[PDB]
Design an enzyme around this catalytic site. Structure first.
Site, short mmCIF file in Angstrom:
data_model
loop_
_atom_site.label_atom_id
_atom_site.label_comp_id
_atom_site.label_asym_id
_atom_site.label_seq_id
_atom_site.Cartn_x
_atom_site.Cartn_y
_atom_site.Cartn_z
N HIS A 61 -6.27 -9.62 -10.49
CA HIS A 61 -7.01 -8.92 -9.44
C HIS A 61 -6.50 -7.48 -9.31
O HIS A 61 -7.27 -6.57 -8.99
CB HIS A 61 -6.86 -9.63 -8.10
CG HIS A 61 -7.27 -11.07 -8.13
ND1 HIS A 61 -8.58 -11.46 -8.32
CD2 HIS A 61 -6.55 -12.20 -7.98
CE1 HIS A 61 -8.64 -12.78 -8.30
NE2 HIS A 61 -7.43 -13.26 -8.09
N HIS A 91 0.87 -2.57 -4.80
CA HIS A 91 -0.21 -2.65 -5.75
C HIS A 91 -1.20 -1.58 -5.38
O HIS A 91 -1.05 -0.93 -4.40
CB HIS A 91 -0.87 -4.00 -5.74
CG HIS A 91 -1.45 -4.34 -4.41
ND1 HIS A 91 -0.73 -4.96 -3.42
CD2 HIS A 91 -2.66 -4.07 -3.89
CE1 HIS A 91 -1.49 -5.08 -2.36
NE2 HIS A 91 -2.67 -4.54 -2.60
N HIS A 93 -5.67 -0.46 -5.63
CA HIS A 93 -7.09 -0.77 -5.78
C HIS A 93 -7.67 0.54 -6.33
O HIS A 93 -7.34 1.58 -5.88
CB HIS A 93 -7.78 -1.16 -4.46
CG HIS A 93 -7.14 -2.31 -3.78
ND1 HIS A 93 -7.56 -3.61 -3.92
CD2 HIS A 93 -6.03 -2.37 -3.00
CE1 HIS A 93 -6.79 -4.41 -3.22
NE2 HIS A 93 -5.83 -3.70 -2.66
N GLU A 103 -10.17 1.35 -0.59
CA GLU A 103 -10.64 0.31 0.32
C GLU A 103 -10.97 0.91 1.68
O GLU A 103 -12.12 0.87 2.14
CB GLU A 103 -9.61 -0.83 0.38
CG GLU A 103 -9.65 -1.56 -0.92
CD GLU A 103 -8.98 -2.88 -0.94
OE1 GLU A 103 -7.96 -3.15 -0.27
OE2 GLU A 103 -9.70 -3.77 -1.45
N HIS A 116 -1.11 0.15 -1.74
CA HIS A 116 -0.73 -0.74 -0.65
C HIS A 116 0.71 -1.16 -0.85
O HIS A 116 1.01 -1.88 -1.81
CB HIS A 116 -1.63 -1.97 -0.61
CG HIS A 116 -3.00 -1.65 -0.15
ND1 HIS A 116 -4.09 -2.47 -0.36
CD2 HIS A 116 -3.46 -0.56 0.51
CE1 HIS A 116 -5.16 -1.91 0.18
NE2 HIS A 116 -4.81 -0.75 0.70
N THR A 195 -7.00 -7.66 2.43
CA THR A 195 -8.31 -7.24 1.94
C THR A 195 -8.78 -8.09 0.78
O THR A 195 -9.84 -7.80 0.21
CB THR A 195 -8.31 -5.78 1.49
OG1 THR A 195 -7.47 -5.66 0.34
CG2 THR A 195 -7.82 -4.84 2.61
N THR A 196 -8.02 -9.11 0.37
CA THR A 196 -8.52 -10.08 -0.59
C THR A 196 -8.36 -11.46 0.01
O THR A 196 -7.56 -11.67 0.93
CB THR A 196 -7.72 -10.05 -1.90
OG1 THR A 196 -6.39 -10.49 -1.65
CG2 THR A 196 -7.70 -8.65 -2.48
C1 LIG Z 1 6.35 -15.26 -4.99
C2 LIG Z 1 6.52 -13.78 -4.75
C3 LIG Z 1 7.73 -13.09 -4.65
C4 LIG Z 1 7.68 -11.71 -4.41
C5 LIG Z 1 8.88 -10.78 -4.26
C6 LIG Z 1 6.49 -11.07 -4.28
C7 LIG Z 1 5.32 -11.77 -4.40
N1 LIG Z 1 4.08 -11.07 -4.26
C8 LIG Z 1 3.32 -11.47 -3.10
O1 LIG Z 1 3.73 -12.32 -2.37
N2 LIG Z 1 2.10 -10.72 -3.00
C9 LIG Z 1 1.11 -10.77 -1.99
C10 LIG Z 1 -0.17 -11.08 -2.81
S1 LIG Z 1 -0.91 -12.36 -1.67
O2 LIG Z 1 -0.44 -12.66 -0.36
O3 LIG Z 1 -0.99 -13.71 -2.26
N3 LIG Z 1 -2.34 -11.70 -1.01
C11 LIG Z 1 -2.35 -10.35 -0.48
C12 LIG Z 1 -3.63 -10.00 -0.36
C13 LIG Z 1 -3.94 -8.72 -0.06
C14 LIG Z 1 -2.97 -7.83 0.29
S2 LIG Z 1 -3.64 -6.26 0.78
N4 LIG Z 1 -4.78 -5.77 -0.36
O4 LIG Z 1 -4.31 -6.48 2.04
O5 LIG Z 1 -2.53 -5.33 0.86
C15 LIG Z 1 -1.62 -8.17 0.23
C16 LIG Z 1 -1.28 -9.47 -0.20
C17 LIG Z 1 5.33 -13.11 -4.62
ZN LIG Z 2 -4.28 -4.24 -1.38
#
Ligand SMILES: Cc1cc(C)cc(NC(=O)NCCS(=O)(=O)Nc2ccc(S(N)(=O)=O)cc2)c1
Ligand SMILES: [Zn+2]
EC number: 4.2.1.1
Length: 257
Positions: A61, A91, A93, A103, A116, A195-196
């Site tokens: 994504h 990350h 977008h 976004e 973000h 946002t996802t």
């Molecule tokens: C297991 C481990 C360990 C470590 C260090 C990091 C990670 N990475 C992590 O947890 N990432 C979050 C991705 S998510 O929660 O699944 N969904 C999410 C969706 C949108 C946004 S946004 N676009 O609103 O900012 C932000 C997050 C994972």
């Molecule tokens: Zn994001």
């Protein structure tokens, strides 16, 4: 499952994630002439000096640069926030064209991309618990416009060849996220969501007024990534942004006049 295509994109997400039509969804349009200066807002405190990046991952994504969040090493405090929020990942977008990709929008203006920096409230112990709380996350959002190169970004750009496809990861230690910030920390803030999917309503959004500039070559390298896994049909990772959602019963506050 979900994505950004015609058949699985943002207009479909509500079927699996009904909160997509909720009361505090993100992103939103930031109407600069309706946002109100709040003099009780405090300067942001970005404390990234001890940040420990570990890895960069293509998750199908976007790509995430992950950090060690088992200690207060890179934290966001101040501004609208109560307490300490630990940086877990960043990350972006971005668009297929320089005129779209962000976004959030500012007076309906779309930027080429949006960064973000995702942080979680340490009072909840871990990121998985934090996402279940209305004040669990603070995401610092930074707009990208195409112009001069951002030197701070180039080491991200140069590892992307090693994570072209979904599920690939690479070691990515010693990266300094301070090199991705603009000069000013003036910001807008409002309560929102991821946002996802799963679109959880757990985010205090802090969106910086000043964009950073990146070069055309830098953003072109984002656009060479793939949404698919290796050996699956190639689909370029572009236009991985959700459009602005209704503001509903929310006010956007500005830290500046
Ligand atoms: C297991 C481990 C360990 C470590 C260090 C990091 C990670 N990475 C992590 O947890 N990432 C979050 C991705 S998510 O929660 O699944 N969904 C999410 C969706 C949108 C946004 S946004 N676009 O609103 O900012 C932000 C997050 C994972
Ligand atoms: Zn994001």
């Amino acid at each position: 499952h979900w994505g950004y295509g015609k058949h699985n994109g943002p207009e479909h997400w509500h079927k699996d994630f009904p909160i997509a039509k909720g009361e505090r969804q993100s992103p939103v349009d930031i109407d600069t002439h309706t946002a109100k200066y709040d003099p009780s807002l405090k300067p942001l405190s970005v404390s990234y000096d001890q940040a420990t990046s570990l890895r960069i991952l293509n998750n199908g994504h976007a790509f995430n640069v992950e950090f060690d969040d088992s200690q207060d090493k890179a934290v966001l405090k101040g501004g609208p926030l109560d307490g300490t929020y630990r940086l877990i990942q960043f990350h972006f977008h971005w668009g297929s064209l320089d005129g779209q990709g962000s976004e959030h929008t500012v007076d309906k203006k779309k930027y080429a991309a949006e960064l973000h920096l995702v942080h979680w409230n340490t009072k909840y112990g871990d990121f998985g618990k934090a996402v279940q709380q209305p004040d669990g996350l603070a995401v610092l959002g930074i707009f990208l416009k195409v112009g001069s190169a951002k030197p701070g970004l180039q080491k991200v750009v140069d590892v992307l060849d090693s994570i072209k496809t979904k599920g690939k990861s690479a070691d990515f230690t010693n990266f300094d996220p301070r090199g991705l910030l603009p000069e000013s920390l003036d910001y807008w803030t409002y309560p929102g969501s991821l946002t996802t999917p799963p679109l959880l309503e757990c985010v205090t959004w802090i969106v910086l007024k000043e964009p950073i500039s990146v070069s055309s070559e830098q953003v072109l390298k984002f656009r060479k990534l793939n949404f698919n896994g290796e050996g699956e049909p190639e689909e370029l990772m572009v236009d991985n942004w959700r459009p602005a959602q209704p503001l509903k019963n929310r006010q956007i506050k500005a830290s500046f006049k």
